[PDB]
Design a protein around this ligand. Structure first.
Ligand SMILES: O=C(O)c1ccc[n+]([C@@H]2O[C@H](COP(=O)([O-])O)[C@@H](O)[C@H]2O)c1
Ligand SMILES: O=C(O)c1ccc[n+]([C@@H]2O[C@H](COP(=O)([O-])O)[C@@H](O)[C@H]2O)c1
Ligand SMILES: Cc1ccc(C)c(N)c1
Ligand SMILES: Cc1ccc(C)c(N)c1
Lengths: 347, 347
């Protein structure tokens, strides 16, 4: 089933991309003058789910919520209940992503993949358990739990495509999740924990040493295999991270674009690309996270964010903020006039 | 008159900014987690024309169009008539800024401050002459012509404020204008011409040496005084550059925000800040121009753009692209919920 999923991810349509480039070169402007906006429009044109042209229909931001057992290691200053409280606030439209998604005309889907609290009405229920295992002393979950969630979220994502959604944004919510995210980044990039462990949600500079030690213990004890993205996710990841990876696999299978968010999303994208390299062409960066390990993670994904906002909230807020940029590349493509029509000739 | 203008530019309102910061710190998120979006909202709150709160009413992009005599020195590959043709296309909504402004819900004002062609219907007429003087052999214009245009554009800009406009964007259109822009940057920053001369609108790499020589000749022959922003503008600038500087002085006098665009706008902002330092707090960067001298210009304005799009079209296209970011900071401020209301307490 998951093998079928991964097997059926479409390659980009080179024919549509060639037609796109030619059309862009003929627009009313010096060739290549709109830089990354042009490359973005061509990238979009190659995505099968977009019907050979850069376009944006409905937009959705999927927010994966879960708690982590590693919170008990004192790696986070936010009360663990904030996960459940914020998840509820998501249904009320008062959070950061809700406000930014509203601005971009996108709908937010709040998905509970493992919150340690009673079920929250209004939230999509896909909970694996009440929080994942404490990665400092063992695995976050079993391989089967990771594979099942990947499959479940993948299907949900591509099912939305059937309802008009053509652009996705990924996000998360889970106290302490920058710890497993750092563990995954260290494992995938081969970087020492000290280089990728950040302050997360305002962790005091005096408590960073403990966080670094926790990440190292998690790796030593679990011995995750860097060449097996699912092994890494299940051992030192979390339900929320798995869920984000699932959105990326689902959209790619659907041949549609996915906007990344911040540091947590970069770790999930590293896992997704390890599991299936064919997912890469569907990923679009949004902003450059203020988290310490962002530069290393982005270098390994070979991505250069469009927005430098020093943001570090998460929730998919950066993804929503970049949606207007994607629509701008589409507007450029479809609405600009052409050089030939104005009798303009440039060498 | 111009002395009155410069004298009456308001200082930022520290009281409104303090109230803004306190409100932002209390929003439903870890303090400072939205980074530059928070600093932007506070900056806006201090602008008197915004009534003590970050808000955006109507938006306008002012595009200054003019031709340059230095075009005859072979520093540009685009036919000189493109200025007049593109200015006309601006009235038809087919250009890059028109499409991006439409996306942001902004109106484009096309202003002819010196196009070397017959008047174009639909374009605001403020032409000083049919193109400015060739800066390679003398001044672009007289000091009085520069001062008069500054005053004229300044008044037009603040007059729009009376019609609901609260956010401005500046742009230009003029073949060969990256040459005087480079001259101004060299003069204001004390950088050698070779470090700030770029390829402009696809100038062949083999013709760059000539462009560098032209910039040096312009400076040697005119001897512009770096401490007199108006002296520099009139000697080695152009009508379009003067006009952009005028929008910045007008909006600041009006106590309203102005979004910069690319390299041409950075040179105009250096002039404006030299003429009146009080203008600085009203300037908002948009993107990081692909032009070679952008890094140096931005360092001297002490600005860090939000968008890295490798754009180099001009027209105010980058300014329009960043307008959604300004509205996002306002939406964050007014629409997010508060920590206290959810009983959340963070150290
Ligand atoms: O998206 C980022 O780059 C990001 C960077 C730092 C912190 N966060 C958010 O803060 C939480 C993780 O921080 P922490 O200290 O509990 O590990 C989680 O709920 C994220 O939404 C998010
Ligand atoms: O805005 C920029 O950063 C920008 C950078 C390079 C070129 N341009 C545009 O191209 C023109 C100047 O290029 P050039 O080669 O004629 O000096 C002018 O009409 C600008 O709108 C604009
Ligand atoms: C077509 C065309 C050519 C050159 C420039 C600078 C613009 N703005 C447009
Ligand atoms: C309030 C609050 C606290 C911590 C985080 C990570 C979010 N998203 C929100």
């Amino acid at each position: 089933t998951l093998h079928a999923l991964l097997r059926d991810i479409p390659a980009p349509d080179a024919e549509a991309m060639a037609r796109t480039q030619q059309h862009i070169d003929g627009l009313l402007k010096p060739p290549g003058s709109l830089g990354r906006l042009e490359t973005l429009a061509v990238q979009l044109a190659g995505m099968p789910g977009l019907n050979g042209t850069p376009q944006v229909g409905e937009k959705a931001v999927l927010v994966m919520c879960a708690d982590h057992g590693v919170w008990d290691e004192g790696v986070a200053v936010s009360p663990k209940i904030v996960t459940a409280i914020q998840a509820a606030n998501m249904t009320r439209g008062t959070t950061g992503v809700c406000v930014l998604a509203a601005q971009a005309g996108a709908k937010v889907h709040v998905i509970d993949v493992g919150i340690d609290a009673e079920p929250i009405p209004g939230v999509v229920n896909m909970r694996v358990a009440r929080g994942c295992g404490n990665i400092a002393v063992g695995p976050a979950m079993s391989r089967l739990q990771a594979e099942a969630l990947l499959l479940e979220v993948s299907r949900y994502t591509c099912d939305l495509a059937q309802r008009g959604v053509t652009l996705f944004g990924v996000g998360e919510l889970g106290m302490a999740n920058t710890t497993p995210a750092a563990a995954m980044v260290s494992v995938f990039t081969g970087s020492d924990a000290k280089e990728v462990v950040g302050i997360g949600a305002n962790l005091p500079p005096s408590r960073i040493d403990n966080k670094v030690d926790v990440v190292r213990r998690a790796i030593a004890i679990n011995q995750p295999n860097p060449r097996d993205g699912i092994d890494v996710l299940s051992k030192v990841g979390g339900f929320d991270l798995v869920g984000m990876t699932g959105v990326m696999l689902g959209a790619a299978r659907c041949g549609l674009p996915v906007l990344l968010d911040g540091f947590l999303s970069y770790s999930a994208a590293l896992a997704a690309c390890q599991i299936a390299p064919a997912v890469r062409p569907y990923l679009i960066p949004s902003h450059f996270s203020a988290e310490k390990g962002a530069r290393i993670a982005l270098a390994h994904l070979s991505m250069e964010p469009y927005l430098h906002m020093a943001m570090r909230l998460g929730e998919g807020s950066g993804a929503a903020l970049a949606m207007p940029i994607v629509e701008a590349a589409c507007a450029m493509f479809h609405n600009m006039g052409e050089l030939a029509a104005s009798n303009i000739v440039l060498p």
